């Protein structure tokens, strides 16, 4: 949202449709996805031995 609600002191008048104004956009947050990898190493020299 990024409300950005800094208030301070606010006391306005009817001074002909104040034009300055202010506006904050919506900020974005984007993560990433990691790739895991676990390898196995086994040889028949020991794969058959009980």
């Amino acid at each position: 949202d990024a409300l950005a609600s800094v208030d301070g002191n606010n006391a306005h008048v009817e001074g002909s449709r104040a034009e300055d104004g202010e506006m904050k956009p919506t900020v974005i947050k984007s993560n990433v996805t990691q790739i895991l990898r676990k390898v196995v190493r086994v040889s028949d020299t020991a794969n058959t031995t009980a």
């Binding site: 306005h12 008048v13 009817e14 001074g15 002909s16 449709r17 104040a18």
Partner: protein
């Protein structure tokens, strides 16, 4: 006679703020049936 054209009405305008600007317009014209009917005097010397 007075030829009227606008007939002032409830006219509003922009705001651009908290105030409320208003106006009243009117379009009017004079008419005389015959110029040689009435008369006028003009004060001066000589």
């Amino acid at each position: 006679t007075q030829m009227v054209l606008r007939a002032p009405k409830r006219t509003e305008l922009a705001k651009d703020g908290s105030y409320e600007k208003w106006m009243i317009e009117m379009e009017v014209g004079l008419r005389h049936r015959n110029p040689y009917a009435s008369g006028v005097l003009f004060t001066a010397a000589g």
